[PDB]
Design a binder for this molecule. Structure first.
Ligand SMILES: NC(=O)c1ccc[n+]([C@@H]2O[C@H](COP(=O)([O-])OP(=O)(O)OC[C@H]3O[C@@H](n4cnc5c(N)ncnc54)[C@H](OP(=O)(O)O)[C@@H]3O)[C@@H](O)[C@H]2O)c1
Ligand SMILES: COc1cc(CN(C)c2cnc3nc(N)nc(N)c3c2)cc(OC)c1
Length: 205
């Protein structure tokens, strides 16, 4: 199994809402744009052999545009308990997060050209819940949507509330850009009627 640390990436409203009717209820191409630099930024040097992995629950699998997947230039994995089958041309399915890490280790690492850098959990609500309970999850890359938009799916942990202030801490913007690479919009950003912000949250293992 594991070695390295997991990163969770999410776009939620101040009330923890993350979905509605199996899609992510807003229109943000600058915020969708950010999910890509994050999810695929491997340091210039290692950039030769190293590729990032995004992990996802099947619904999200589904919820991702036909045109958009499999997410390019990242090993794509899907977590589905009842691994029925899986259409793909080199995309895995794993019974859990745990099985998924064992599948990547076994598969890569060894007699491979392909090495993994950073491992991401992109969702959904079900997979988010299991990564939050994983001893290896230490960081949350969160976009905050400052609107009380109607959702039917919620982030399972109020990580930003007082109840969790001795475990998750909001890091400095400078260390947010230092972790991604690229320069990232400081403050409040407004695109399509909404005000949002980029935060990086970290916990100690
Ligand atoms: N705002 C955001 O950033 C954001 C990001 C991602 C998702 N969301 C949204 O959330 C919605 C989908 O959320 P969701 O919670 O319903 O679905 P999900 O986790 O995306 O898909 C759920 C399925 O995936 C598998 N799965 C998830 N956690 C698992 C575990 N611990 N062990 C085994 N299988 C697990 C199971 O699949 P089987 O049924 O195949 O066993 C479970 O029914 C959509 O609106 C999606 O777009 C929002
Ligand atoms: C092109 O790549 C995609 C990926 C999705 C997957 N998805 C539900 C989604 C969307 N935005 C997100 N934003 C941030 N910060 N974090 C996430 N975890 C996230 C997840 C949907 C999509 O169609 C518009 C395009």
């Amino acid at each position: 199994n594991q070695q390295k640390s997991l990163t969770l990436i999410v776009a939620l409203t101040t009330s923890y809402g993350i979905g509605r009717s199996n899609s992510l209820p807003w229109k943000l191409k600058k915020e969708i744009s950010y999910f890509k630099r994050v999810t695929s930024f491997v340091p210039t040097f290692d950039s030769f052999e190293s590729m990032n992995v995004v992990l996802m629950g099947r619904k999200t699998w589904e919820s991702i545009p036909l045109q958009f997947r499999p997410l390019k230039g990242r090993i794509n994995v899907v977590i589905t308990r009842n691994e029925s089958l899986d259409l793909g041309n080199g995309i895995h399915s794993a019974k859990s997060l745990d099985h998924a890490l064992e599948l990547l280790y076994r598969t890569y690492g060894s007699e491979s050209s392909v090495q993994i850098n950073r491992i991401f959990v992109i969702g959904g609500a079900q997979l988010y819940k299991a990564a939050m309970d994983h001893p290896k999850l230490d960081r949350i890359m969160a976009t905050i949507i400052y609107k009380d938009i109607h959702c039917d799916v919620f982030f399972p942990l109020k990580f930003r509330d007082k109840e969790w202030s001795s475990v998750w801490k909001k890091e400095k913007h400078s260390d947010l850009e230092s972790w991604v690479g690229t320069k990232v919009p400081h403050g409040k950003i407004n695109e399509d009627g909404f005000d949002y912000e980029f935060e990086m949250w970290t916990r100690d293992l």
